[PDB]
Design an enzyme around this catalytic site. Structure first.
Site, PDB file in Angstrom:
ATOM      1  CG  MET A   1      61.892  67.500  34.888  1.00 16.43           C
ATOM      2  SD  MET A   1      62.084  66.176  36.296  1.00 16.43           S
ATOM      3  CE  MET A   1      61.496  64.610  35.355  1.00 16.43           C
TER       4      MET A   1
ATOM      5  CG  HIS B   1      61.564  67.008  39.963  1.00 19.45           C
ATOM      6  ND1 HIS B   1      61.609  65.592  39.863  1.00 19.45           N
ATOM      7  CD2 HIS B   1      62.113  67.271  41.282  1.00 19.45           C
ATOM      8  CE1 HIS B   1      62.336  65.223  40.886  1.00 19.45           C
ATOM      9  NE2 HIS B   1      62.571  66.034  41.878  1.00 19.45           N
TER      10      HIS B   1
ATOM     11  CB  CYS C   1      58.103  65.835  36.740  1.00 13.38           C
ATOM     12  SG  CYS C   1      58.707  64.718  37.968  1.00 13.38           S
TER      13      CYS C   1
ATOM     14  CG  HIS D   1      62.279  61.539  38.595  1.00 10.90           C
ATOM     15  ND1 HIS D   1      62.385  62.797  38.322  1.00 10.90           N
ATOM     16  CD2 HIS D   1      63.500  61.030  38.442  1.00 10.90           C
ATOM     17  CE1 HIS D   1      63.333  63.180  38.201  1.00 10.90           C
ATOM     18  NE2 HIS D   1      64.143  62.238  38.092  1.00 10.90           N
TER      19      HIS D   1
HETATM   20 CU   LIG Z   1      60.623  64.500  38.069  1.00  8.38          CU
END
Ligand SMILES: [Cu+2]
Length: 97
Positions: free
Chosen positions: A90, A85, A82, A37
């Protein structure tokens, strides 16, 4: 406060997504099942005073269960998300008060 990156079955999302807190609250971003992440603070929507690099953590992280703490202390709103992602949606937001 505790934020789990990657739902247990909802997919890849900031859980919770947006949440207000008190100036002095510990926010821990814990990896739940969607690594690696990444959390970066949109320096385009962050208060004109709170650096976005001191809180952001570009240092990718593929550790299972690994987390990063953050303690903001300026009543306002910080928009983070993020970048990797982002294709899923996200995003993150915290309203300190
Ligand atoms: Cu992420």
């Amino acid at each position: 406060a505790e934020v789990k990156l990657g739902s247990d079955d909802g997919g890849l999302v900031f859980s919770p997504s947006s949440f207000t807190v008190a100036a002095g609250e510990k926010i821990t971003f814990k990896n739940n099942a969607g690594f690696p992440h990444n959390i970066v603070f949109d320096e385009d929507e962050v208060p004109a005073g709170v650096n976005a690099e001191k809180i952001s953590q570009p240092e990718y992280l593929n550790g299972a269960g690994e987390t990063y703490e953050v303690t903001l202390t300026e009543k306002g709103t910080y928009k983070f998300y993020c970048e990797p992602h982002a294709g899923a949606g996200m995003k993150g937001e915290v309203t300190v008060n």
